[PDB]
Design a protein around this ligand. Structure first.
Ligand SMILES: NC(=O)c1ccc[n+]([C@@H]2O[C@H](COP(=O)([O-])OP(=O)(O)OC[C@H]3O[C@@H](n4cnc5c(N)ncnc54)[C@H](O)[C@@H]3O)[C@@H](O)[C@H]2O)c1
Lengths: 341, 335
């Protein structure tokens, strides 16, 4: 009854997507996936395939995606098909959920954090050119139009999800004209939201704070100062790249992914990945589709399978396989259907 | 003899901890004459911001420096006097060592990490301007020659201090041309030094791996394209801004030693600031100058106090004044 675009990507992407649907199959989730196989590494990439995806999004308005790999020989990531997608979908707000999982013990337990950063400018605006025999110049842009959009999105997210306070992370002490503009655009849109606390912090301090005492923050909004560095730092607090889920939003489109996307994110072989990040984002996606029963059910099945400690993958300190772990979440998700009351 | 060194007390919690390290050095009979000089933003004739002349003639004479933190307007105003200070004396290596403190327990055990960052290019290319209304453009530049000088520094540091591994921390997947050059130069110096093991990682990988397990890392080398936020991540591993020290190293034995932390406005003037950072930078300066015995003495005094835990300070374990903490170290050094 509900069509969703699926984009398995490269790497273990196809295994994770197979986990999402064998779980969704076990839970009778009323979702039909439209798969597009867009891989530049396997020679299934072209701008006609990009357009077929925007067509699919113009109808479905919701997608769950992997990571489209880019070949580092003759291509930087800015011209990768993973960037052309986000530009053709005009995704501008990246949303990472840094939330602890009871039973996966780390050094930062009982943590509940969300990171909002802008996704269309700053680093992803970089233009590089050679000015001399051995001198490289990088040009970056910040704009008020894109700072207002991300600060408004942050406070909208903060109220819509019942979050308490919103911290604006910046480096306007040394990037005075650039990031003071973002800082100002934030303080302006904060006056329109009196029920939400608001504070700032210099980016140097925030990173130290995230690892020293992350419990202070609640929602972090920041510009694309340094790319996905903070999302990757924060995702380490809570288990790492195999558990942290992510979503990217547009004015109209919602794209649900994983939160830590360093190039070696789950660079593992044919049956070793953790489906938790993907499965949690799938459940976050179902919530967005207002299937709050199924959304809640999947998420409780996965959160409970890792609280018992029976089936654990390598990253979580365990010897089980990606098929072992999904077959256990399907076992628990079919029990949770037959005995729902 | 008795060597002198330029002291810049700085702004905020600067004058307190400056006084705190001077006393521990007085209490240690340390052969050092402080030349107290002030650096504020005086604006030159052609509008180009310049250091105070009294401060520059002081540094040129002594070629050694211990400075507190400097206020930099957190919105608009003068450009950072620290970027200005680092470039006017061409201190192209910023060395930040994170080692755990044995007395102070933290969620992370036995970290030993040196972050070598290039200290003059990158976002220290101070050109940043307005294109059209509500559109700001920033121009950063990295040169070939600086990339080579910091990679050579990094490998020499790994050798002088008996470190087994060097890791180039880059974003060459995203900033092709810049970091492609830095890796290009890092790789050449690595071929001339097979004794040091070399590898490269993407910075976003490193940040995630670091907060999960710092024991994988040794010395890390970086361009100034991503700021100093890797060593800020590292600062939290061992106890925060009250303990992590710094050094800005230049050629011909010129250096200005400071701490990673800032002016600390919220605690400034309340006599609650931690002077371990500036103290540990001053033992960095001492070992730089060859005063090894005064160094080990002052450093043992500092750690043995932290280990006693009796008179700690608010950023660490419990409430005791910066004055109280500096005194129990002074008591320790003399005995
Ligand atoms: N001179 C420098 O190297 C330097 C470095 C960073 C920031 N600054 C400047 O200072 C300001 C930065 O202030 P900020 O709040 O963002 O960061 P900060 O480093 O000044 O302090 C941030 C947090 O850590 C605390 N803290 C810092 N140093 C401490 C210490 N020695 N002992 C106990 N607690 C300590 C502070 O109280 C605060 O909670 C800016 O103007 C900035 O330009 C200077």
């Amino acid at each position: 009854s509900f069509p969703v675009t699926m984009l398995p990507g490269d790497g273990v992407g196809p295994e994770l997507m197979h986990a999402v649907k064998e779980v969704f199959k076990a839970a009778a989730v009323p979702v039909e996936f439209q798969e597009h196989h867009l891989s530049e590494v396997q020679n299934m990439a072209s701008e006609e395939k990009l357009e077929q995806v925007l067509s699919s999004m113009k109808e479905n308005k919701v997608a769950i995606i992997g990571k489209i790999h880019t070949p580092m020989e003759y291509k930087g990531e800015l011209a990768s098909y993973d960037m052309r997608l986000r530009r053709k979908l005009d995704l501008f707000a990246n949303v990472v959920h840094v939330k602890s999982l009871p039973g996966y013990m780390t050094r930062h337990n009982n943590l509940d954090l969300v990171i909002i950063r802008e996704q269309t400018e700053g680093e992803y605006s970089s233009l590089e050119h050679e000015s001399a025999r051995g001198v490289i110049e990088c040009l970056k842009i910040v704009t008020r139009a894109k700072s207002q959009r991300i600060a408004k999105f942050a406070f909208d997210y903060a109220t819509k999800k019942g979050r308490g306070k919103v911290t604006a992370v910046h480096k306007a002490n040394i990037m005075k004209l650039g990031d003071g503009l973002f800082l100002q655009c934030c303080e302006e849109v904060a006056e329109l939201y009196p029920k939400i606390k608001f504070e700032t912090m210099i980016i140097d301090n925030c990173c130290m704070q995230l690892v020293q005492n992350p419990y202070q923050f609640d929602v972090l909004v920041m510009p694309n100062l340094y790319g996905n560095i903070i999302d990757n730092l924060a995702a380490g607090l809570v288990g790492g790249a195999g558990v942290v889920p992510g979503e990217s939003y547009s004015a109209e489109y919602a794209v649900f992914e994983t939160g830590a996307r360093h190039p070696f994110a789950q660079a593992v072989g044919r049956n070793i990945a953790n489906p938790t990040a993907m499965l949690l984002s799938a459940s976050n996606m179902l919530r967005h589709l207002n299937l709050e029963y199924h959304s809640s059910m999947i998420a409780d099945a996965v959160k409970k399978v890792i609280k018992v400690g029976k089936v654990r993958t390598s990253d979580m300190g365990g010897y089980a396989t990606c098929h072992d772990f999904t077959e256990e979440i399907c076992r628990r998700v079919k029990d949770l259907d037959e005995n729902l009351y | 003899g008795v060597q002198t060194v330029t002291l810049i007390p700085g702004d905020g919690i600067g004058p307190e901890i400056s006084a705190a390290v001077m006393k521990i050095f007085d209490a240690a009979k340390a052969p050092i004459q402080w030349e107290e000089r002030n650096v504020t933003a005086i604006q030159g004739p052609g509008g180009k911001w310049m250091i105070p002349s009294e401060a520059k003639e002081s540094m040129d004479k002594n070629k050694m420096g211990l400075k507190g933190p400097l206020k930099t307007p957190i919105a608009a105003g003068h450009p950072s006097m620290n970027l200005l200070l680092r470039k006017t004396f061409d201190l192209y290596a910023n060395v930040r060592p994170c080692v755990s403190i044995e007395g102070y327990k933290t969620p992370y055990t036995d970290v030993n990490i040196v972050t070598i960052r290039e200290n003059t290019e990158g976002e220290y290319s101070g050109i940043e301007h307005v294109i059209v209304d509500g559109v700001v453009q920033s121009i950063k530049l990295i040169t070939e020659g600086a990339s080579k000088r910091i990679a050579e520094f990094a490998f020499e540091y790994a050798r002088n201090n008996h470190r087994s591994n060097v890791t180039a921390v880059h974003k060459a997947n995203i900033m092709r041309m810049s970091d492609g050059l830095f890796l290009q130069k890092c790789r050449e110096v690595a071929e001339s030094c097979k004794d040091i093991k070399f590898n490269e990682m993407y910075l976003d990988t490193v940040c995630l791996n670091m907060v999960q397990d710092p024991s994988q890392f040794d010395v890390l080398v970086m361009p100034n394209l991503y700021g100093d936020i890797l060593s800020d991540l590292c600062a939290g591993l061992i106890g925060g801004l009250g303990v992590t020290p710094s050094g800005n190293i230049g050629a011909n034995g010129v250096a200005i030693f400071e701490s990673v932390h800032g002016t600390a406005p919220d605690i400034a003037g309340k006599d609650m600031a931690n002077p371990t950072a500036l103290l540990l930078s001053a033992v960095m300066m001492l070992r730089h100058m060859g005063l090894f015995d005064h160094a080990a003495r002052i450093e043992a005094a500092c750690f043995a106090t932290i280990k006693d835990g009796k008179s700690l300070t608010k950023d660490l374990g419990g409430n005791a004044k910066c004055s109280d903490f500096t005194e129990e170290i002074c008591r320790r050094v003399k005995d």
